Ligand binder design. Structure first.
Ligand SMILES: [Fe+3]
Ligand SMILES: [Fe+3]
Length: 162
């Protein structure tokens, strides 16, 4: 029995783990570049299942929804800055740390304010299980579509889709 909270919390552990592996890999190594692509795929599908399934179910918390959408914009705007400093450039590691900082702050502020749903949200254990099952399925669909974009259209087209 899965539920919406566990889907997001476990996926957060995935994303955080990729962030740690990226940080530990040598700058501009083949290993770090592949790990970063993997993070882009997982970020893409994470924000999508939040925007398309999780936040709508939490829509009653209108102020916290606005904040969460604004924090997604924070992360995406910082990713655009990160992508303008290749790993071969001297200031790359500062840009990566700035990105990692913004991303993990959001995910922590999410587990503060949005998991479990705020008190305004009336959602039952049964609904949370069905929503969790929908999210798990949609994350799989989204990962297939993300991979297809990266594989056939390249990293730039994946980033533009966020
Ligand atoms: Fe989020
Ligand atoms: Fe999240």
């Amino acid at each position: 029995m899965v539920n919406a909270y566990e889907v997001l919390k476990e996926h957060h552990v995935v994303i955080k783990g990729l962030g740690r592996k990226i940080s530990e890999a040598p700058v501009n190594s083949e290993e770090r570049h592949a790990l970063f692509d993997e993070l882009l795929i997982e970020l893409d599908i994470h924000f999508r299942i939040e925007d398309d399934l999780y936040y709508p179910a939490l829509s009653a918390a209108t102020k916290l929804i606005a904040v969460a959408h604004a924090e997604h914009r924070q992360v995406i705007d910082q990713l655009s800055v990160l992508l303008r400093t290749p790993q071969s450039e001297p200031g790359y590691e500062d840009e990566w740390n700035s990105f990692k900082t913004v991303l993990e702050a959001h995910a922590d502020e999410e587990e503060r304010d949005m998991i479990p749903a705020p008190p305004e949200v009336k959602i039952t254990d049964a609904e949370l299980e069905e929503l969790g099952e929908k999210m798990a399925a949609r994350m799989e669909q989204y990962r297939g579509s993300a991979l297809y974009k990266l594989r056939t259209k390249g990293r730039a087209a994946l980033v533009r889709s966020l």
